[PDB]
Design a protein around this ligand. Sequence first.
Ligand code: 3KM
Lengths: 241, 4
Amino acid sequence: VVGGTDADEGEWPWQVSLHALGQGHICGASLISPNWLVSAAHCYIDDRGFRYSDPTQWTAFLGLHDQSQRSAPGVQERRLKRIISHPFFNDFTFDYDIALLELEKPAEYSSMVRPICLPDASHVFPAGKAIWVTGWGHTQYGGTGALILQKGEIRVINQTTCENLLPQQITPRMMCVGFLSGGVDSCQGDSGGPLSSVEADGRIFQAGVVSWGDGCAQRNKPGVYTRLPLFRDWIKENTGV
Amino acid sequence: CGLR
Ligand SMILES: N=C(N)c1cccc(OC[C@H](NS(=O)(=O)c2ccc3ccccc3c2)C(=O)N2CCC(CCN)CC2)c1
């Protein structure tokens, strides 16, 4: 996250860290039920040196705060049994950039480990709304990752404005969130983490999946996020959740 | 869901 601040310990108890074996933190994800995580499809693509699509190559850490303290009380480690990438995921365009990760054994709910709420298919996160992005990704473009989970406040951007800012690259599955002036944005290694939106009784709903941006926190290059309401039925059908 |  660029232009953010340290999270308080346990402030985002749905935020999960995905480690590929021998590589440390690669992507974020969100806990949505005892057994299920939401993340970005683009995190799970094989390349010629590593089968990022293979569930056995991954460790999920729940209730994590500090990358250097993965064994702290309240931290839960879990393997994955299955990765489902959206069937319509387009690796060129990052259309449909969403995956569901099945935990090998259920999370244990605690004050540090708790699911985010999913929005109904008809819910619209409106333009202008303040929402939160979190993660252990780069804290500058061309920078290094955070040891301590970072939070930043960003704002939903009008879709037409979004499409005009990034011509030929924005589909209806994507949402711009952040500021035309830059300054606060998600970044490399935040990918697949949730946007957290404070809703009417103060409960947090997931408003997006961190997907891509042109660099990070540049002027006129807001962060691009996979929308959640559009996949409520897809999540239901694949997970039971 | 959604609280601390
Ligand atoms: N700003 C943001 N809110 C944000 C959110 C998330 C990550 C992020 O990091 C920087 C990076 N941005 S880039 O301009 O260098 C770029 C890289 C690959 C691309 C591929 C296709 C089309 C466009 C691309 C653009 C990026 O988007 N990444 C990390 C690299 C990852 C693929 C390799 N794992 C794609 C996501 C920034």
